């Protein structure tokens, strides 16, 4: 549907180049060959990591917190004095099935370097080997460990795509455990809700157009990670639950304008505002899902600055 | 493009009914016949006014402030204690050429009655008989009069469509006059910027699709009101100017998801956030430009509540 439009006239020349490379880099069909699929996205994430290391200077260490593998990503210059008593948890994307290692660094590096903060990126259990709520348990275990060193108000959690879904689910799991809620979250290109509204049609997630009979959208996320979880499970789909929505911490919702998640994120932001939760929504016209894993455009740097700015204004400072 | 989609699955049954009423209310072709066009929209605004008076109980008085005709719109039994020291200025839409009288009450009534506040709706000079900056001068004259009774921090300005554009232009005119900036504004379905990005194509403002050559979009607003004003006039187009944007007050940007203005509002929100201005963006998936002139749907009431809540949180309270 969108292929009939010119590129958004808001875009930098650099973004217009990225969009052509994104389309050219599209995966072939894998037909259930998970090993071939994982190898393709391992290469994709390694390619984006090379681009990140050209732009940003960071140091990464492996750690284990409460039996969960993490990578701790810091600016090579060191964390700023302002951020000495803050930390972010990153939850990587990758369709709930890949993104471990380089995909996690691709999300953590630009935010660690831009904000000047420590980012703990979680190597959570993946589908299809593991199922909901495995990733919630993993992120909550990391969060529990960081509460030994950082006040809850000074901890942020963010993730992109599948990671934005898991970030919202981790919040409800933290509450289920009786832990203090995090200071702020980023649910980027995804949250604790099914895809809905117009954007999945416009992005072609569901086929539509001349002579073509558009089906209703599912009220569940189709991923194997979520199979058999009901739409009524407020911990799994909190941005459809008035109760879990009221308990959300301050939330940043960021998407591309051509991102299949954007209709759901605009509704989530309306629900957070009605519930009295501090939330912020940004849309980058013309850009796709999870666009800011491609760092070679001003729009990605701009996104990193909005993420850094949100955490810098919402997280506590004091030890 | 959008006729191939089902209605957004987020919409209430009432909104799906309003969407069909909107289609039935669409103007026939006028061939530049301004008299016929004005008569058509007079009836359209009178029809929406009947619907407003069914839902909301207000009282309206005519006044003149600094030689500008206004209507003062209040809840029928009086303004709330919360809002005794606050006032909103409304700037009606109508393509800069109509909307005087009933069109202005259609924007003022739901916010007066929802927030429980006095709304002064300005009968500003229209195109093509008047040109930029006539409407800025008119709104600034009203603002200057209200500063005799209300602190600048306690005054909000809002408008829809053409009125959102004029609201942003009135802010720059107020600064030109050496007056204190208003406490907050609402630039709804329009701001001080051309329409841009993807949404003008998806809304069908400009033809796109098989066998059609989609043209580039203009860098100026095409209205007679703005004839001969340059793109480089930062007072006319403040949300395209990094200088005028840093001086903006706290801003609410609200649009339908199918609104031709939505791409421009998402960019204006990014620019306000980078300039450190408090701004809030809401998008109502599946709804068109200026949807909330139709009060008979929960989504309109929800929009009125977001407008009231933005002014309630940003305007001062002190006498
Ligand atoms: Cl916002
Ligand atoms: Mg432990
Ligand atoms: Mg808010
Ligand atoms: Mg803000």
Residue numbers in the entry:
A (entry chain B), B (entry chain A): 14 to 332
Sentences copied from the publication:
To unravel the effect of the unusual Cys173 on the properties of wtPMGL2, two point mutations were introduced in positions C173T and C202S resulting in mPMGL2 mutant variant. For unknown reasons, despite the same conformation of the loops 202–209 and 216–237 in both wtPMGL2 and mPMGL2 structures, a PEG molecule was found only in the active site of mPGML2. Each subunit of the asymmetric unit contains one PEG molecule bound in the active site cavity mainly via hydrophobic interactions. Key residues which participate in the cavity formation are: Thr204 and Ala206 which anchor PEG molecule by hydrogen bonds to its oxygen via their main chain, Gly107-Phe109, Thr173-Gly176, Val178, Ser202-Tyr208, Val218, Leu234-Thr236 and Asp272-Ala274. In the B subunit of mPMGL2, the PEG molecule was found in two conformations. Interestingly, PEG molecule was found in the active site of mPMGL2 (but not in wtPMGL2). This finding makes mPMGL2 structure a unique example of family IV lipases with a bound ligand analogue, besides known structures with small inhibitors like PMSF.
Among them, a new esterase PMGL2 belonging to the hormone sensitive lipase (HSL, EC 3.1.1.79) family (family IV lipases) was produced and biochemically characterized. Both of them had a typical α/β bacterial HSL-like fold, consisting of two canonical domains ‒ a CAP-domain and a catalytic domain. The active site of PMGL2 consists of a catalytic triad of conserved His302, Asp272 and Ser174.
